[PDB]
Amino acid sequence: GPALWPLPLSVKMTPNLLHLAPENFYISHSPNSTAGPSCTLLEEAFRRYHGYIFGFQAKTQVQQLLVSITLQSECDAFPNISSDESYTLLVKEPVAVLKANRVWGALRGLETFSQLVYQDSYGTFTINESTIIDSPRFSHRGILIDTSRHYLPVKIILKTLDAMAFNKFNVLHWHIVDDQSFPYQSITFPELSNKGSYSLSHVYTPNDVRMVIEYARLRGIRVLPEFDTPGHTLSWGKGQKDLLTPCYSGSEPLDSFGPINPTLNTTYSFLTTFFKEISEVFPDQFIHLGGDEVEFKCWESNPKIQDFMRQKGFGTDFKKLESFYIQKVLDIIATINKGSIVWQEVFDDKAKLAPGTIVEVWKDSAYPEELSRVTASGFPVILSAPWYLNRISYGQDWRKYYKVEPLDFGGTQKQKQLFIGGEACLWGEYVDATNLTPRLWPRASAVGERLWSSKDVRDMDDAYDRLTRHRCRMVERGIAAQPLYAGYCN
Amino acid sequence: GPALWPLPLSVKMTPNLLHLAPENFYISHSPNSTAGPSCTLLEEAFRRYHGYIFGFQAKTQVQQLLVSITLQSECDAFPNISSDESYTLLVKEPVAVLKANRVWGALRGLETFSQLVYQDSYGTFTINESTIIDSPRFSHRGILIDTSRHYLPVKIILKTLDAMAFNKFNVLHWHIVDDQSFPYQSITFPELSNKGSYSLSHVYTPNDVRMVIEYARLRGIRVLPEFDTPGHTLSWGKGQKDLLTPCYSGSEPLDSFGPINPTLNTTYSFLTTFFKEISEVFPDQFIHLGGDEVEFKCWESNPKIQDFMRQKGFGTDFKKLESFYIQKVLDIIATINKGSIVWQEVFDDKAKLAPGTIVEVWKDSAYPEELSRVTASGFPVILSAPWYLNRISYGQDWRKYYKVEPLDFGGTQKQKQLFIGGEACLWGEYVDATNLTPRLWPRASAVGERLWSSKDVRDMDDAYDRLTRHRCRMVERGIAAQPLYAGYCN
Ligand SMILES: *[C@@H]1O[C@H](CO)[C@@H](O[C@@H]2O[C@H](CO)[C@@H](O)[C@H](O)[C@H]2NC(C)=O)[C@H](O)[C@H]1NC(C)=O
Ligand SMILES: *[C@@H]1O[C@H](CO)[C@@H](O[C@@H]2O[C@H](CO)[C@@H](O)[C@H](O)[C@H]2NC(C)=O)[C@H](O)[C@H]1NC(C)=O
């Protein structure tokens, strides 16, 4: 049988068995599609899905899958938070039809169609007459990866994007820099990577970055960069002088450095020129600014910064200085026509945010109540908090992730519509190429289903059954996803 | 610099720098060795170590490493609990010398020698004049793998044995069968695997088994089979009729089966013929019989078995019947001239064990006190309890494993000499090819050092430093061992 994951909104199976012959089944454009043979996204997806599927017998052969895009295709464009991913799939003989408003929905449908196929004993490719109409519950469905704590070669990022397609994720939250290393190669500031990277072959070139973004685009995945300020910036200091706060002990200067120094005009003119470059390089609408876990110790220790605090009336409240900072950075982003996402502390520590500004809730301390507050104040929200997949544990933790119901928090029908989705996060301290893929999948698939499927989809026995088979399939396709429990594939 | 792991007993470094040239350094026999060019074990080890190492300049070139075996080589033989693994290593120009009593010690020394080499910036292979004299603290240093909960292809077992060599482990505890599947292919009982395996390509053939054993032997590793009775035998029932206990509810027979039925003469004549085959197939001295976690529910529910209990005077004490069973199996093993290892329950539940019988302590509930009791009664003991590496957790759990001091239990100098070592265990419920290697290494390396190195070797900063580098090396050699924490290799 078929393992669908994520389980589509409406499935209508019949017991009518159809067959696909490897020597002649193929996927092509409907003559009525708005996308042509000119469509690179779709053609490459036809080829790669033909591969996935393979590499009384009268009137039972499905010869073709025809793919029809109904509205302007968006074939040439980058996906975005409002990209229409809906499709319908009509599996019948002799010609199955996949129909979608846009390119994005057909990529989804191709995956689902591939999941409908199954071999019996003899190795006959089999699929049931069925009709599927599908669309996602939420539209921001993210994986966070961290390429600072460890560098991830591009290949592993590519493989992760493939896995994301298979699971219908659509945002790659690329936490590209942080304390330990700055691998991003900046054209306007070559020295950030030159001095901040682990070494000169742990770098992402403009070509590497172009590659990740196009490879994502071809799979209907947005690349959301995070360049976390003003904490988590140790590695930035190496290449930009006078950017970080010099730490002091009383009046003795220490060799150590703290967060970015929000009191200097050279800080903001650096950030202005830096984020201009980010806005040109990453085509997504949103830039993630970070703002998590700022340590005040070093700021409050610094003499010139203490001057700046009396000089503003901030007293001993270092939340106001952190706010002063992030507000200035928020303006920088608005000025070059992008949107901003922000870890919850920026909101908790009482910064003043332009409306439109997305807030990401990560702290697992009564997060429903954060979701309440954030939505109460009018701001779109995204949840990662219960999906910190760096935090491993013995056993079937996939259930814990799967059982989350993100909208079980206090608020109105309309507060709740500001919840635009979720991200599974795989912070990198303990993760690199050697262990990424099996740590991430299929644990993140639990999150994929919860974010795509109906609220009502919750049966644990049925989830286990479908996820065991989906995981076996991921492995067939070269994604080393780990087991759920005892058993075997083939 | 060099990362030694495990840290040898005595290292004496000088600051005299020597160089190895890739175009001409080579490893060969000392003309005074008891092993010849006829020695397969050593020749293959020379070749593969040459690969690992590579693939004022007067009087600084080390041209050769010469390898001298001093006593009868044991080149043709299988290692065993008394195999001498001691060696000494004299690194000097122009000819370094490795000298060992036996083949086993030279394999160890070759690894250590390889760990002494390091590249500087230009890519010059560099090593310091030094003198190392080394031997293990304990002689049973095991990895447990479980090929029932998941099948592991031979290749992954081979790769694990390579990793074990790199870490100076010397026992592969092959928990080959269990409840979920029986992959072992028996010549005298073809139906165990035919009906008990997951499928017919999740099997270990006599050729696969020969391969694992020889590949182990060539690396100075013993293969200790465990064929766990009488619990953990569900999969055995499929191919041997009337072997398992039929479960009952009152007088209603259930479809379900429990442990092996210790009351039938067909049970022991099966076991006799089965373990004869095991003794011929696996050349190691010891067979692990299991005896862990027997559930009595089903035994006590069975009518014929309740007859057997009144008929023995056992009352309601199902420990005595379990004992009656394991004692009979112990005799079977003694009769075909092998030794037996046994999970602690066999000892706790008050079975009568021939002296010589090794007891493995696994329960993490006051295990020092188990070590006391077991040694008090005269029995060799092995510890796994604090090294259940299936039980993952967030963070640097390698420290927890490393900080164990196994002889911190009550007893005499002579009780303590019955502690012959340890095993890191990677039970398979959550583990298969996709995730084995990074889950196991380098976490098991913590155990490798504790079992090889001096009791005194304990500094955590120094362990972290050497283990980070050893782990980077494991990765260079194609063992995908996971990170300890943030950072980079090369
Ligand atoms: C896909 O088609 C197959 C074959 O028609 C369905 O399987 C059969 O279902 C009937 C009841 O509807 C059973 O009596 C048969 O024993 C089933 N198996 C086979 C191999 O013939 C199958 O259920 C269909 N799938 C779905 C999800 O409806
Ligand atoms: C999100 O996606 C759509 C599709 O790319 C964008 O809107 C369309 O843009 C094309 C030109 O590329 C126009 O011809 C259409 O008339 C647009 N339709 C609209 C605005 O509804 C949209 O701008 C994208 N959003 C962001 C923020 O980039």
Ligand SMILES: *[C@@H]1O[C@H](CO)[C@@H](O[C@@H]2O[C@H](CO)[C@@H](O)[C@H](O)[C@H]2NC(C)=O)[C@H](O)[C@H]1NC(C)=O
């Ligand atoms: C291996 O030899 C090197 C080079 O002699 C040693 O490194 C030098 O040690 C001296 C002090 O003994 C320092 O003053 C130098 O700065 C060191 N480094 C270099 C690159 O010259 C190294 O310590 C030796 N290794 C050990 C473990 O003794």
Ligand SMILES: *[C@@H]1O[C@H](CO)[C@@H](O[C@@H]2O[C@H](CO)[C@@H](O)[C@H](O)[C@H]2NC(C)=O)[C@H](O)[C@H]1NC(C)=O
């Ligand atoms: C453990 O190893 C040694 C070496 O193989 C075994 O003892 C030697 O065996 C060879 C023949 O293969 C003899 O020529 C020696 O005289 C033996 N030396 C002894 C007994 O000290 C030993 O038997 C092995 N132990 C087991 C249990 O197999």
